[PDB]
A paper describes a structure:
STAT6 becomes activated in response to IL-4 and IL-13 and mediates most of the gene expression regulated by these cytokines. By direct interaction with specific parts of its transactivation domain, STAT6 recruits the co-activators p300/CBP and NCoA1 (also called steroid receptor coactivator-1, SRC-1), which are essential for transcriptional activation. In particular, the interaction between STAT6 and NCoA1 is modulated by a short region of the transactivation domain that includes the motif LXXLL (where L is leucine and X is any amino acid). Here, we report the structural characterization of the complex between a STAT6-derived peptide encompassing the region from Gly783 to Gly814 and the NCoA1 PAS-B domain257–385 using NMR and X-ray crystallography.
In this crystal structure the residues located in the N-terminal part (Gly783 - Pro793) are not ordered indicating that this region is too dynamic to be resolved in the crystal. Nevertheless, the new X-ray structure of the complex clarifies the structural role of Leu794 whose side chain fits into a deep pocket on the cofactor surface formed by Phe314, Phe300 and Ala310. Yet, there is no interaction visible between the residues N-terminal of Leu794 in the crystal structure. Therefore, we decided to perform a structural characterization of the NCoA1257–385/STAT6783–814 complex by NMR. Importantly, the interaction between the NCoA1 PAS-B domain and STAT6783–814 is further stabilized by the interaction of STAT6 Leu794 with a shallow hydrophobic indentation constituted by the PAS-B domain residues Phe314, Phe300 and Ala310, seen also in the X-ray structure and in agreement with the alanine scanning mutagenesis data where F794A reduced the affinity about 50-fold. In addition, the two isoleucine residues (Ile786, Ile790) located in the N-terminal part of the STAT6 peptide bind into a shallow hydrophobic pocket on the surface of the PAS-B domain formed by Phe314, Met318, Leu346, Pro356 and Ile358. The NMR structure of the NCoA1257–385/STAT6783–814 complex indicates that the coactivator recognition mechanism by STAT6 occurs by the formation of a partially ordered complex in which two α-helical regions (Ile786-Ile790 and Glu799-Glu808) are connected by a linker that adopts an extended, albeit dynamic, conformation. This dynamics in the linker may act more strongly onto the N-terminal region of the STAT6783–814 peptide that has fewer interactions with the NcoA1 PAS-B domain than the C-terminal region, ultimately rendering residues 783–793 disordered in the X-ray structure. Thus despite the invisibility of the peptide N-terminal to Leu794 in the X-ray structure, the complex formation between the NCoA1 PAS-B domain and STAT6783–814 is well defined by specific interactions in solution.
Numbering used by the authors:
A (entry chain A): 260 to 348, 356 to 366
B (entry chain B): 794 to 808
């Protein structure tokens, strides 16, 4: 269970691929992406968000990876995800794996 | 770095 994003080299997400999520047979998947992303961009206590940390890392060295982060679906289902991204040749390919 | 807004995500998911 996962989905993919590409970001331009300023950080703006320029597309999302929900293919594998749509192939996965569960409802709720739009809320899920929306929530997972917002979590990904949520500051971390006092440290910057995972999205800010990975974007600075991936631009400096072409790969970055986040720990698990948790987020909550509309019905209060609790999920977690983590993100891996690579700089491709110019854009950032990110994958977001849902540990369920 | 700037987070996406709910309208931005609506855009992305329509494409």
């Amino acid at each position: 269970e996962s989905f993919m994003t590409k970001q331009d080299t300023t950080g703006k997400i320029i597309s999302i691929d929900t293919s594998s999520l749509r192939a996965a047979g569960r409802t709720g998947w739009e809320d899920l992406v929306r929530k997972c992303i917002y979590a990904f961009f949520q500051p971390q206590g006092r440290e910057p968000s995972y999205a800010r940390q990975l974007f600075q890392e991936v631009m400096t060295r072409g790969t970055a990876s986040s720990p698990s982060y948790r987020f909550i679906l509309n019905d209060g289902t609790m999920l977690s995800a983590h993100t891996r991204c690579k700089l491709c040749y110019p854009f950032i390919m990110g994958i977001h794996i849902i540990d369920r | 770095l700037l987070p996406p807004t709910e309208q931005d995500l609506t855009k992305l998911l329509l494409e």
